[model samples]
Target: DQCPALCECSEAARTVKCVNRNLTEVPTDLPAYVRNLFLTGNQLAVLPAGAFARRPPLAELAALNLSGSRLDEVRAGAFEHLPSLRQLDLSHNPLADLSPFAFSSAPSPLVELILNHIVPPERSFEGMVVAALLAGRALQGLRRLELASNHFLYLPRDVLAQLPSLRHLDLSNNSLVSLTYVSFRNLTHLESLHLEDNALKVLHNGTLAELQGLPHIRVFLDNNPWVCDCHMADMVTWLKETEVVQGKDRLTCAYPEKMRNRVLLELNSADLDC
Candidate 1:
């Protein structure tokens, strides 16, 4: 029946909202029966182990919103034993150091994991890949994974292949320059793939052919530095034959002195200098 200071509790909703509280730690007196916890806009620097494990455990927790929090480190078993947890938002944090077993302590039922900008600018590229790899260790039920705005130069195929149930993958706003046929070989359930706002200058026919196998997939490839030249011959042909590309009409050329600003789908093979 007690709620922490400056937080609003609702018995009807069984939810606790501690938005913009400036509190440095999770409230010790959060109602045991609370199911949905919104702790956005806080300064929780380190999410320690058993943070939510009350005397009887907050087993009713289904969703947690920790976005915009100043979280830097997450220790192992930080989110252990809450069986009902399905959605988790850890976006917009300075999350750099993640214990490899951080989310592996439990076979969590998490389905949607939002981790935008989890790595800070100072974090090394290796640290970023390791952090991403941590998610694939467990969370087998995960379906929708948001990994935008992270500094990942290449796709982690080993980790992605483990997530067979993943359907929506958002890799926009990164620095991915190339992709191989095996990049998404195992993601058979994927329906929507976002690769916008990257550094891709060219996509060979062999690489684009991999996407065609995913029957109902829609790809977003806008804002990439596409070099429209002889090397883009097959890709240009692919763009004309298939309707898989979402923004195909808006995909313009960023190279070749004469083809600058020319839409990709409009150019024919005859226009190429090859």
Candidate 2:
């Protein structure tokens, strides 16, 4: 099959790779069996519906990487026919606004989603992620969600409690201060959670207690300003009871200059007096 001049297509792998080709639009009518499409480092600005309309449905495609493409718009059902597409990497695209269907119309039980830095600067993608998680129609089987580097103060209560299933979550490098009891409410199957590098000052009494729903999980709670006090007793207790949270040896205090810079595990319960 003849292919677009600016793109390289591999018939053996049914894949296409385009880079720096200055492509302003999606290549339509791709072979129906194209399984992977990588437009990394391209100039595609907007992807309207039917962009891939040439194919009846990209039934076999599994991955779409649009990273660093300077994407400005991603319409609904942009890949509606890519039902088998499980990974959509939209990391680092500076989109002014993300439509509700930008990612959900794919109709796949997404295994991985990457939206790093797509969030409007000084804004949280919480509402967008929540909208996709709540009764929206896609991402029900999301396994790993990477929304790091977005400055989020906190998630709306219960915003994540309803995700159908999840294994890994990266909400790192934000300004989040707290998580409610219902935050990870139904993520019983979660295995890894990343919450490091933020403005977090405390792990409220039930913060981890609320996370008891998970049996096997590892949390990255390092690199944040942790205020150690009676407020952390519950967290300290939970930290001792489970191997879920790493950085036990490096968990330092950021408050009460008396206990300042002290390792959390090295402190006795009496030292955490409120």
Candidate 2 Cα errors over 4 Å, as ranges: 105-107, 122-125, 132-135, 156-159, 181-185
Model 1 lDDT tens row, 138-229 = 86777888889987887767556777678888989999998863465445788988999999988887677777767778899999988887
Q: Against the true structure, whose TM-score is highest?
A: 1
The C-alpha lDDT values of all candidates are 0.81, 0.75
Least accurate stretch of 10 residues (summed lDDT) in model 1? Answer: 125-134
Task: TM-score each candidate.
Answer: 0.92, 0.87
Clashes in model 1: which pairs?
none
